[PDB]
């Protein structure tokens, strides 16, 4: 499946792109619309960080474990399926009983080969690969104990028949969970609307809170996406980003260029100050406190980002992007009040490589949704030609120091979201 011979020069060639990171983020799960942040986190997980063991007595993993917790029908199962396709040594398992391979090791006579075999579980069969666990919230007690041991010590301890062994499982765990009650509640913390204990949640570098909300524009976009899929795969006749997608073949080969390890000798005062500020905020506000493991996961994600660019040294942009990812994961997992406060105070960290067009689009969506809720609360339904003044958008763009909205109005992204600029009355409005 992999040879990587003479194929390395073109790998380095597109590594020279200086926008290869966005190309790779754009080239995963091409069949899933949107979810750009989950795609970036899954790309980091695929490349992973640097395992280290100072001496032989302090073991830190390089694996980046991703937990997708989101209300139903949001392509989490599809994400896991894609990761299984794109990677070598990926085995897919489910928290229910609906899979070939279970999480726990056992020894038994094999049903078809009749051979007494040690059925080392899903965690160790993916020893240097990926363990994809769907329905993560629906595990047994013993599956939870197996996953805790594998995520904690990176080995599985059998003491079952006469076998006493510790056979090891150094996998990246990508899990998908449904929230308690079938819908994520932003007024609760991540830990208290998912049926997982803190020891398990703490073992995940990225916690992606997938969130099914009714946005008419994205609803139209997704509906077009999926209906187009249904049209083009009709048995008779047998994609929106700034960057070109990269074909999954050279992409598998590119990711398989993990033969080169990687190393970092870069800034420490910025990172240390950032953690100190995070501590002061997260212990001022009554929130989930940042800890050491958060900076260690940030280091993993920086190493992964450097590996995506084949750098062999973390560069300040790798660190900055890892900070943005670690903070996005840490901030979305707070309750709503704390999430707003941290979005505000850490916004300079949080908007790295987040250009003006998308920030402004987010603000505009926020105001238009505010307006639509206001309308439909005492008008029975949302109206047609939903609009908003120029001024308040200008005001909020100043609040984040934009002051130049002209390119936002000329933007492809502005037009793509069914927006329009009406300079006659300083109005901007949506069609639906």
């Amino acid at each position: 499946g992999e040879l990587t011979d003479e194929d390395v020069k073109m790998i380095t060639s597109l590594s020279k792109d200086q926008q290869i990171g966005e190309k790779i983020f754009a080239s995963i799960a091409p069949s899933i619309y949107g979810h750009e942040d989950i795609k970036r986190g899954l790309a980091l997980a695929l490349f992973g960080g640097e395992p280290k063991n100072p001496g032989g007595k302090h073991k830190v993993r390089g694996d980046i474990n991703v937990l997708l917790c989101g209300d139903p029908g949001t392509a989490k199962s599809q994400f896991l399926k894609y990761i299984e396709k794109v990677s070598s040594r990926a085995i897919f398992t489910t928290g229910q009983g609906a899979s070939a391979v279970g999480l726990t090791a056992y020894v038994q006579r094999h049903p078809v080969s009749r051979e007494w075999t040690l059925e080392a579980g899903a965690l160790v069969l993916a020893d240097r690969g990926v363990c994809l666990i769907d329905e993560f919230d629906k595990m047994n007690d013993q599956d939870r104990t197996s996953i805790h041991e594998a995520m904690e010590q990176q080995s599985i301890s059998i003491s079952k028949a006469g076998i006493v062994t510790s056979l090891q499982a150094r996998c990246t765990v990508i899990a998908a969970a449904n929230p308690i009650g079938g819908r994520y509640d932003p007024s609760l913390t991540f830990s208290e609307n998912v049926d997982l204990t803190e020891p398990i949640i703490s073992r995940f570098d990225i916690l992606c809170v997938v969130r099914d909300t009714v946005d008419p524009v994205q609803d139209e976009m997704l509906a077009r996406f999926v209906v187009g899929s249904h049209v083009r795969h009709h048995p008779s006749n047998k994609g929106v980003e700034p960057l070109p997608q990269e074909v999954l073949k050279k992409y598998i080969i590119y990711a398989k260029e993990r033969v080169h390890p990687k190393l970092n000798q870069m800034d420490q005062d910025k990172v240390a100050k950032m953690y100190s500020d995070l501590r002061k905020e997260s212990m001022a506000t009554g929130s989930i406190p940042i800890t050491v493991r958060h900076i260690e996961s940030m280091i993993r994600m920086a190493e992964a980002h450097a590996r995506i660019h084949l750098r062999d040294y973390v560069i300040e942009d790798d660190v900055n992007m890892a900070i943005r990812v670690m903070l996005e994961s840490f901030i979305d997992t707070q309750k709503f009040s704390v999430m707003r406060s941290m979005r505000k105070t850490f916004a300079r960290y949080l908007s790295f490589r987040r250009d003006n067009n998308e920030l402004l689009l987010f603000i505009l969506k926020q105001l238009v949704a505010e307006q639509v809720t206001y309308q439909r609360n005492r008008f029975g339904a949302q109206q047609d030609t939903i609009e908003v003044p120029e001024k308040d958008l200008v005001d909020k763009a100043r609040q984040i120091n934009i002051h130049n909205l002209s390119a936002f109005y000329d933007s492809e992204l502005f037009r793509m979201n069914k927006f329009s600029h009406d300079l006659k009355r300083k109005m901007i409005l949506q069609q639906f």
Binding site: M283, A284, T285, G286, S337
Partner: protein, 92 residues
């Protein structure tokens, strides 16, 4: 002696837990009632004891050992220790 010192650093939760529970609970119990006696006025002309509260105990009497209890109050948030800092950091 070394064994007894190592064990003293575990009597420090056998016993010291109660002692610093009392020290922080002096402030905890003082904040427990006065922050709701004025709670009819917690929405009136003055929002809430905003920043003078730390200085309130200063005059009639430790910033380090009182800010910690303040954060412990602020950790949960239901009626008074929430709506204090809901309008505090906004209004400074």
């Amino acid at each position: 002696e070394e064994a007894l010192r190592l064990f003293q650093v575990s009597t420090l939760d056998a016993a010291l837990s109660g002692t610093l529970s009392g020290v922080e609970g002096f402030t905890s119990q003082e904040d427990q009632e006065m922050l709701s006696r004025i709670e009819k006025q917690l929405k009136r002309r003055f929002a809430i004891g905003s920043q003078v509260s730390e200085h309130s105990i200063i005059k009639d009497f430790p910033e380090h050992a009182i800010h910690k209890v303040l954060q412990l109050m602020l950790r949960r948030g239901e009626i008074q220790h929430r709506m204090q800092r809901k309008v505090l950091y906004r209004l400074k």
